[PDB]
Antibody, heavy 214, light 219 residues
Framework: EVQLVESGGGLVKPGGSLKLSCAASGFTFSSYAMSWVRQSPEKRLEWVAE????????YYPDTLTGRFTISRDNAKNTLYLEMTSLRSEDTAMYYC?????????WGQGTLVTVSAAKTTPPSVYPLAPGSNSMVTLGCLVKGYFPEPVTVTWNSGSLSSGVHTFPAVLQSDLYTLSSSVTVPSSPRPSETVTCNVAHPASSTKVDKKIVPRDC | DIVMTQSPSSLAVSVGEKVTMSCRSS????????????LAWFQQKPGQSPKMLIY???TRESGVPDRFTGSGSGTDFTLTISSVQAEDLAVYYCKQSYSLYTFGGGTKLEIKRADAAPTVSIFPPSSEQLTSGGASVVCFLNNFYPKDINVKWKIDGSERQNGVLNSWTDQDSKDSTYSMSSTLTLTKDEYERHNSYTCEATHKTSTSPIVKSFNRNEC
């Protein structure tokens, strides 16, 4: 399968600079014109730049012309995107995209958060019973920045009965929850644990849900 | 640059309904000699990256269910779904490749289903969180429809509207239901000064509210 993995994204102070990169694989990358598309938090898709197969040509939307610079390396098979004077409105998910019908594919994207706030790892708290047919466990992932935070249950094994609610911004800090249901038979007999992850802080944490106290 | 426009912003249909979405371009995307319109249709499901469904106005990408078909030419295009399925939930963006590229604002396809009562759950603060001066009581109102709902907390028969935040998930791609968590955050202190913590959920599903509560570590 074809693969476009972008990286270099993350939190950046306004007026700052960032160089996004994209690793092409699964096809003859040098035989295709590659583009960079971005999605605002508001979910608006915006084409930012395209570079010809041979890299001898770049095209940008009047607007992005100047602060954004697309470049490629056919020997390395990677696509690059240089952003300058990074404003807050430049906060968005940046995708590596191929628009040719034969190789129409986009990467999973790299988030870019243009803010002055600081990176703070999340705090993972288990949401156990309290004081039935099915058991619904939780996991509070609070006080982190910036986005995102991926939550999986039991190494993802429990796909499904899982609900990971979107985060809420409170004082430059995001906090989200994640439920998960399993028959009453399983837990606590069988264990359930949520695997939280926070890339910006390289935080990898696991929290098993224990039957509280008593 | 060429501006693209898409409306309506939203659309709600029942599984099996035929839906059409319009997308307009600021200038003709038609190649006079071939009658080919450089207009494509992208679909983006929650959490996933956009994926090309149709290109050249009416050419379906390989492997794309045939209930998906696009038409139109020039500056007027339409994306038709003959039998909207639950998995079709997503935002469909239209893009022009006549001169550079331009995406449309996109139209959200929502699924209409039979009303469903939410399954509520109340969770007292973890000892860990208290061990830092934090009291977060979470409430899980899972898998319901429609989205509208009421959730209020009642600390000792008294209603609390301060220090509470709600979060709704995207509609489900299988059951098409919604889910929402309501959290009440008080300081480890402000939390101990009371004992009754209740979460009141009043969905259109029923007239009698769903009350799930607990008394301070009664256990």
């Amino acid at each position: 399968e074809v693969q476009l993995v972008e990286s270099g994204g993350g939190l950046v102070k306004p007026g700052g600079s960032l160089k996004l990169s994209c690793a092409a694989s699964g096809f003859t990358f040098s035989s295709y014109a590659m583009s960079w598309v971005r999605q605002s938090p508001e979910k608006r898709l915006e084409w930012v730049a395209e570079v010809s197969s041979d890299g001898s040509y770049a095209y940008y939307p009047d607007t992005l012309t100047g602060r954004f610079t697309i470049s490629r390396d056919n020997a390395k098979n990677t696509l690059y995107l240089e952003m300058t004077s990074l404003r807050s409105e430049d906060t968005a998910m940046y995708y590596c995209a191929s628009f040719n019908w034969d190789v129409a594919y986009w990467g999973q994207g790299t988030l870019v958060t243009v803010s002055a706030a600081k990176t703070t790892p999340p705090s993972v708290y288990p949401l156990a019973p309290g004081s039935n047919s099915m058991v619904t466990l939780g996991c509070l992932v609070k006080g982190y920045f910036p986005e995102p935070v991926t939550v999986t249950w039991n190494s993802g094994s429990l796909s499904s009965g899982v609900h990971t609610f979107p985060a809420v911004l409170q004082s430059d800090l995001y906090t989200l929850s994640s439920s998960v249901t399993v028959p009453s038979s399983p837990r606590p007999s069988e264990t359930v644990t949520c695997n939280v992850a926070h890339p910006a802080s390289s935080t990898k944490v696991d929290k098993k849900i224990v039957p509280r106290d008593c | 640059d060429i501006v693209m426009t898409q409306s309506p912003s939203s659309l709600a249909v029942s599984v099996g309904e035929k839906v059409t979405m319009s997308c307009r371009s600021s200038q003709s995307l038609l190649n006079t000699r071939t009658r080919k319109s450089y207009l494509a249709w992208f679909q983006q499901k929650p959490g996933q990256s956009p994926k090309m469904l149709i290109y050249w106005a009416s050419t379906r990408e390989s492997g794309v269910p045939d209930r998906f078909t696009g038409s139109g030419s020039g500056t007027d295009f339409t994306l038709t779904i003959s039998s909207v399925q639950a998995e079709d939930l997503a935002v469909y963006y239209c893009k022009q490749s006549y001169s550079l590229y331009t995406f449309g604002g996109g139209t959200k396809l929502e699924i209409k289903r039979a009303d469903a009562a939410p399954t509520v759950s109340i969770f007292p603060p973890s000892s860990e969180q208290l061990t830092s001066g934090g009291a977060s009581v979470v409430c899980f109102l899972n898998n319901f429809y429609p989205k509208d709902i009421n959730v209020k907390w009642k600390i000792d028969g008294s209603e609390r509207q301060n220090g509470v935040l709600n979060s709704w998930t995207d509609q489900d791609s299988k059951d098409s239901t919604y889910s929402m968590s309501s959290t009440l955050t008080l300081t480890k202190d402000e939390y101990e000064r009371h004992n009754s913590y209740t979460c009141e959920a009043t969905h259109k599903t029923s007239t009698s509210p769903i009350v799930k509560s607990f008394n301070r570590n009664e256990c």
